Amino acid sequence: LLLMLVLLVAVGQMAQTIYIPAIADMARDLNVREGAVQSVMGAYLLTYGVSQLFYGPISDRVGRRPVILVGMSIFMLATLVAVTTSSLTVLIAASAMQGMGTGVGGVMARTLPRDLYERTQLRHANSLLNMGILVSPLLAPLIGGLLDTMWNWRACYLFLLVLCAGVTFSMARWMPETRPVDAPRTRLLTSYKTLFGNSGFNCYLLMLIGGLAGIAAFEACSGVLMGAVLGLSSMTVSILFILPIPAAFFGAWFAGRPNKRFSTLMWQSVICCLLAGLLMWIPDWFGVMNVWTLLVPAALFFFGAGMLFPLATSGAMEPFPFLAGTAGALVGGLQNIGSGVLASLSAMLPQTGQGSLGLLMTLMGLLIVLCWLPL
C-alpha cells in the first residue's frame, strides 16, 4: 500500500521535475530554442489533463503494473539512445511526456490515500507531502549532484519504479471496471441558469490555469538551461510544492475563505510585482511557486464538491476538460506567440498575457465571493 505509492511516485517526480531542467538543457540545445520549452509546460498539462480525465476510465479496469509502470519504463530504455540524436527530433518530446507519465501514477496516489482520509481528519497534504518531499531533495542533488544525469535518470526512474513493481504485486483492485464503456461527454444543456453559479466557478479555474499555462511558460522559462539553477529549477519548484501543500490544508478551508480566489487573486498580481521587484531570484522563481499553490487547493475543493455529485460525469468535464482545455488554448497561442513575438524586446505583449491572468483572477475573485445559495 503506502510504500508502493512512495516508490512509484518517487520515480514519478524524479523523472518529472528532472525533465524540467533536462528539457531546458537539451531543448535549449536543439532545433526550436526556448519556444519549445514553453511548449513542454503545455505538455505537462497534456499528460495530467488526459490522465485524470481519460486515465480516470483507465483507472477503472486494470493496467497499473503492466501498462503503467512496466510499459512507460521499457519505453524509457528507448530513452537516452533515441533521445540523443532524436533528442532534437521530437524525442525531447517523448522523454518529457513519459516523465509526467509516472506522474499519472501519482494521480491514483491521491485517490486511495483519500480513503485513508475517511479514517480520521486527514484532507490531502498526506499523499501530496509524500510526493512533494521526495521531489525536492532527490531532484536537486540529482542533476545538481553530478551534472548530466544520463544513467542517473535511467536509475532513478527505472530502479524506483521497478522497486515499486517488485513490491506492488497488484494489478488494481477495490475499484470498478471498463474504460471503453466509461469515457464521458455532455453539456450545459442541463447546466442552464447554473451559468450564474457553475460558470462563476467555471470562469474561476478555467481562466486560472489557462492564463497560468502562459504564465507557466514564463516562470519555468527563465534560466541558463543546463546549469545548477535549472537542475535546481526542479529543486526550487518542488521546495515550494511542499510549503504551499500544508498551507493548502488550511488553504482548502481557505478555498471557502473569500473563495480561495482571494488567494489566487492577490498572488498572481504579486507575481507580477516581483516580476519587476528585486534582483533576479525572487521574481519568476516565486512565479512557479505560486502557480502550483493555486493548483492544489483549487483541485482540492474541486475534487470533493465536484466529482461526487451527478457532476461526476459533469464534474470530470468541469475541472478536467474545461481547465486542461483552457491550458491547451494558451499553449497554442504560444506556438504562434513566439513565431510572432518577433517584436524584439517584446514587453507589453507577453506581459499582457501574464498580467492578464493575474488581474483576471482579481476581478473573478471578489465577484464570486458575493454569491451564495444552497440548492
Add this chain to the structure above:
Amino acid sequence: LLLMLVLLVAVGQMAQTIYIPAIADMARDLNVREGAVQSVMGAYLLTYGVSQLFYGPISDRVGRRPVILVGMSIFMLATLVAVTTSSLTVLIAASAMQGMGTGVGGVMARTLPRDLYERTQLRHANSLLNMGILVSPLLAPLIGGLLDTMWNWRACYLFLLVLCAGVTFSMARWMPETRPVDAPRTRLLTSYKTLFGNSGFNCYLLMLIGGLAGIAAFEACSGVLMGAVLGLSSMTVSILFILPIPAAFFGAWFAGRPNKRFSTLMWQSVICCLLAGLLMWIPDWFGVMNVWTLLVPAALFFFGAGMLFPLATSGAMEPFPFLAGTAGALVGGLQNIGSGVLASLSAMLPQTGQGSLGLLMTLMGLLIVLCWLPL
C-alpha cells in the same frame, strides 16, 4: 421639411464620403501613413456612435441651426488653412470628423421621415435614398471631377449646409427637451436571463460592427490614396449604399428572415472569398459594399423593436453604446496592430481579424435562428 433635409444631408454626405478619399489623400501624405486612415474609419463610428447616443439627448432641446449647421460649418472655414500645415497635425483629424458631423444631421433625418412612415407603408428606404443618392454622384464628379477639390469641398459643405439653413429657418420643434437631464446609463441587473435572449442579439450586432470596424479598416484601406479610385472610393461606397438600401426594405422583413444574420453570415464570409477571388476591383471594394448593407437593416429592426420598449434607455444602451463600443475596441487593437504588424507581409494576422468577424457572424447567425419566445 423634406427639402431642408435634402440640403443638410447633401452637404453631410458630400463632406463625409469625400473625406474618405481626402483622408486617403492627405493621410497617406502625412506622418502616420495608412495606420491613420484605418483609425479614420474608427473616427466614423466615433462620430455616429456618440451622435445617435449622446446627440440623442442633444436632439431633445434645441441647437439644430445654431450649433449643428452654423457651428460645424464655421469650423470648416478653419478647415483648409489649418488643415494643410496641421493637415498632418491632427487636422487631418478635425476635418474628417466634421464631415461625419453633418452626417449626424442625417441621423435626425431618418427620425422625422419615420413619422412620414406612420402615414402609410413606408419603412426606411425613403430618407436613406435621399442621402445615399446625393452621395454617390455628387461625390464622384467632385474629386473625380477636377482633382484636389479644395474650395470645392468648401463650396459643397458650406453652400449646401447654409442653403439648408437659409431655407430651414427652424430650431427644432415637435420634440422634448434637456440633454443635461437626459444622458442614460444602466445595466443587465434587470437584464438577467435576458442574457439568453438579449445577449443572443447582443452578440449579434456587438461583434458584427466590432470586427466590422477592423474589416472597415481593410476594405476602405485599399487604393492609391489620392487618385480617381479614392475619390471614387467615396463614389463606389455610396453607389452600393443605394442598392442595399431598398434591398434593406425587404431586408428588414429579411431581418426577421433566418434572422437577417443569415444575410450578414454568408456575406462577410463571401467578402473573404472575393478577398482571394478575382482581379483587384471586386474583392475589398465589395467589402465596403456589404459592410454598409449589414449596418442598415440591422439598425432597422433594432431601431423599432429596440428603442420603443423600456429598452429605450436600455435600447440606447444596446445598439448605440454596445455596438459602437465594440467598434472602439477593435480600433484600439488597430493602433497597436500596425505598431505590431511589423511582421512584414502579415497574412493570417490581420486576415484572422477580418475572417474572424465573418465566420463569427456565421455561428451566431444559425445559432440565434433557433430561439423564439414572446414575453
